[PDB]
Enzyme design. Structure first.
Site, PDB file in Angstrom:
ATOM      1  N   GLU A 113       0.652  -1.267   0.035  1.00 29.32           N
ATOM      2  CA  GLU A 113      -0.035  -0.203   0.010  1.00 29.32           C
ATOM      3  C   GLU A 113       0.893   1.465  -0.087  1.00 29.32           C
ATOM      4  OE1 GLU A 113      -3.024   0.079   2.806  1.00 29.32           O
ATOM      5  OE2 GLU A 113      -4.151  -1.923   2.084  1.00 29.32           O
ATOM      6  N   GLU A 167      -4.949  -8.476  -0.678  1.00 33.09           N
ATOM      7  CA  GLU A 167      -5.258  -8.345   0.981  1.00 33.09           C
ATOM      8  C   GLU A 167      -6.603  -7.670   1.044  1.00 33.09           C
ATOM      9  OE1 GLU A 167      -2.679  -5.907   3.562  1.00 33.09           O
ATOM     10  OE2 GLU A 167      -4.698  -5.139   4.658  1.00 33.09           O
TER      11      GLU A 167
HETATM   12  C1  LIG Z   1      -9.999  -3.401  14.669  1.00 33.75           C
HETATM   13  O1  LIG Z   1      -8.717  -3.286  14.480  1.00 33.75           O
HETATM   14  C2  LIG Z   1      -8.158  -3.638  13.129  1.00 33.75           C
HETATM   15  C3  LIG Z   1      -8.211  -2.660  12.078  1.00 33.75           C
HETATM   16  O2  LIG Z   1      -9.228  -2.342  11.478  1.00 33.75           O
HETATM   17  C4  LIG Z   1      -7.175  -3.434  10.827  1.00 33.75           C
HETATM   18  O3  LIG Z   1      -7.179  -2.293   9.923  1.00 33.75           O
HETATM   19  C5  LIG Z   1      -5.935  -3.842  11.411  1.00 33.75           C
HETATM   20  O4  LIG Z   1      -4.934  -2.776  11.674  1.00 33.75           O
HETATM   21  C6  LIG Z   1      -3.498  -3.294  11.503  1.00 33.75           C
HETATM   22  C7  LIG Z   1      -2.872  -2.344  10.606  1.00 33.75           C
HETATM   23  O5  LIG Z   1      -3.208  -3.157   9.478  1.00 33.75           O
HETATM   24  C8  LIG Z   1      -3.440  -2.471   8.328  1.00 33.75           C
HETATM   25  C9  LIG Z   1      -4.743  -2.476   8.050  1.00 33.75           C
HETATM   26  O6  LIG Z   1      -5.398  -1.928   6.766  1.00 33.75           O
HETATM   27  C10 LIG Z   1      -4.460  -2.510   5.683  1.00 33.75           C
HETATM   28  O7  LIG Z   1      -4.902  -1.616   4.582  1.00 33.75           O
HETATM   29  C11 LIG Z   1      -2.851  -2.542   5.678  1.00 33.75           C
HETATM   30  O8  LIG Z   1      -2.676  -3.266   4.646  1.00 33.75           O
HETATM   31  C12 LIG Z   1      -2.536  -3.030   7.223  1.00 33.75           C
HETATM   32  O9  LIG Z   1      -1.103  -2.777   7.472  1.00 33.75           O
HETATM   33  O10 LIG Z   1      -1.318  -2.424  10.750  1.00 33.75           O
HETATM   34  C13 LIG Z   1      -0.676  -2.238  12.276  1.00 33.75           C
HETATM   35  C14 LIG Z   1      -1.466  -3.410  13.012  1.00 33.75           C
HETATM   36  O11 LIG Z   1      -0.876  -3.373  14.470  1.00 33.75           O
HETATM   37  C15 LIG Z   1      -3.004  -3.407  13.086  1.00 33.75           C
HETATM   38  O12 LIG Z   1      -3.402  -4.624  13.789  1.00 33.75           O
HETATM   39  O13 LIG Z   1      -6.259  -4.774  12.137  1.00 33.75           O
HETATM   40  C16 LIG Z   1      -6.730  -4.564  13.427  1.00 33.75           C
HETATM   41  C17 LIG Z   1      -6.758  -5.566  14.497  1.00 33.75           C
HETATM   42  O14 LIG Z   1      -5.992  -5.822  15.376  1.00 33.75           O
HETATM   43  O15 LIG Z   1      -7.718  -6.514  14.438  1.00 33.75           O
END
Ligand SMILES: CO[C@H]1[C@H](O)[C@@H](O)[C@@H](O[C@H]2[C@H](O[C@@H]3CO[C@@H](O)[C@H](O)[C@H]3O)OC[C@@H](O)[C@@H]2O)O[C@@H]1C(=O)O
EC number: 3.2.1.136
Length: 389
Positions: free
Chosen positions: A138, A227
């Site tokens: 991304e 993804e």
């Molecule tokens: C409810 O929390 C969740 C988030 O909504 C979800 O976006 C994800 O966040 C991640 C974060 O991931 C990005 C998500 O969007 C994608 O487009 C991108 O490729 C990802 O890199 O990155 C940091 C990570 O620590 C978070 O977990 O997951 C969340 C969750 O933990 O369930």
């Protein structure tokens, strides 16, 4: 109405379906969970693809191995996506008034190519032949990682991707914004170093699923959805019904409108993922299974009446002497659907259904009358038919 399934109208070749593993951010899968994810037995997902991340710090690489080894053992292919280069390769810069914006240093491209190559090599020495590696996750939505313009991506694809000892995935837009990929497709040299056009579909409308330019210039290139989560990441949403039915409709659109060859979820194990935290399969999971368990790597999508009644969605695939039909009924009313096979004859039809009250549950067998068969599609249900030839 009638669903026509033309066994000779061949479309995209399918590479598979799966999800992400991230031990750092999500916690590695347990040994049992790896069986559930990649095994194609009863109560297992039969995921045929695994995504893992290329850590910016090589000392963390070892953490990916056990789960990746497991996937290979089960015949899944593995690919990898980088979020950041190693910090010494990254500079800040002023991106439209944001000065915290990170990018790869213009004089570090070669060194980053080598970083990615090192990961391929590392994974190999642990018995994992990475199927493919990405240039950047991304790059057009990198607020919390490393930004790349279309032109910066182009330069790297022209000049550095060729040095990578693996299939290269690019550009992994968050939303399948064509402006990030157009430059590559329009440049012979960059195109030559791209093996898989990769994309995400966060907020992408179905009208933006087709990609005319790819159809025109992308011969010999794969097209992968690397993804997504859909329709949301609401806490504990994984079992909500008929919500879960959105998952298979989304896959239906990726296959049928996007002509994608891979569909990869985010975190495999999550309260909104295919696998719940107790390690059982969610309703979202079973929606994926209706594809993943039956549409094996190698299968080919074939032409089939995509949407023959309101809220009824159909897609078909052939492979290993079977025709696989996935029929999603999103309405609150059972419909009777008639399925006609053109340029091909069959005999017995098996099926599994998922609904409010059942998971991938065998239905009665059906038999082919000439070139067709009737089947009832329960209200708010997904069925997979398996047709023997
Ligand atoms: C409810 O929390 C969740 C988030 O909504 C979800 O976006 C994800 O966040 C991640 C974060 O991931 C990005 C998500 O969007 C994608 O487009 C991108 O490729 C990802 O890199 O990155 C940091 C990570 O620590 C978070 O977990 O997951 C969340 C969750 O933990 O369930």
């Amino acid at each position: 109405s009638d669903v026509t399934v033309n066994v000779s109208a061949e479309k995209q070749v399918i590479r598979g379906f799966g999800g992400m593993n991230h031990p750092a951010w999500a916690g590695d899968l347990t040994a049992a969970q790896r069986e559930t994810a990649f095994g194609n037995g009863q109560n297992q997902l039969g995921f045929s693809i695994l995504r893992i991340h290329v850590d910016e710090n090589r000392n963390n690489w070892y953490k990916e191995v056990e789960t990746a080894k497991s996937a290979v053992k089960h015949g899944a292919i593995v690919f990898a996506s980088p979020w950041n280069p190693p910090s010494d390769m990254v500079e800040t810069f002023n991106r439209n008034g944001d000065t915290s914006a990170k990018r790869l240093k213009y004089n570090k491209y070669a060194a980053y190519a080598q970083h990615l190559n090192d990961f391929v090599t590392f994974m190999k020495n642990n018995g994992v032949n990475l199927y493919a590696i990405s240039v950047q996750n991304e790059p057009d939505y990198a607020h919390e990682w490393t930004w790349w313009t279309p032109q910066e991506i182009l330069r790297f694809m022209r000049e550095n991707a060729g040095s990578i000892n693996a299939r290269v995935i690019a550009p992994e837009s968050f939303q399948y914004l064509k402006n990030l990929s157009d430059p590559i497709l329009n440049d012979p040299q960059a195109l030559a170093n791209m093996d898989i056009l990769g994309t995400h579909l966060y907020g992408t409308q179905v009208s933006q699923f087709p990609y005319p330019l790819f159809k025109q210039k992308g011969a010999g290139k794969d097209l992968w959805m690397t993804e997504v989560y859909y329709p949301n990441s609401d806490t504990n949403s994984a079992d909500r019904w008929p919500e879960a039915l959105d998952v298979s409709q989304h896959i239906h659109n990726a296959m049928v409108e996007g002509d994608f060859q891979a569909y990869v979820w985010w975190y495999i194990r999550r309260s909104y993922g295919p696998m719940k935290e107790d390690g059982t399969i969610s309703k979202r999971g079973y929606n994926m299974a209706h594809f993943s368990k039956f549409v094996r790597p190698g299968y080919v999508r074939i032409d089939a009446t995509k949407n023959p009644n309101a809220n009824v969605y159909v897609s078909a695939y052939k492979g290993d002497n079977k025709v696989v039909i996935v029929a999603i009924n999103k309405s609150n009313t059972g419909v009777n659907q008639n399925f006609v096979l053109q340029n091909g004859s069959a005999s017995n039809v098996s099926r599994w259904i998922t609904s409010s009250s059942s998971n991938l549950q065998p239905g009665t067998n059906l038999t082919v009358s000439g070139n067709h068969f009737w089947a009832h599609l329960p209200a708010q249900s997904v069925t997979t038919f398996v047709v023997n030839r």
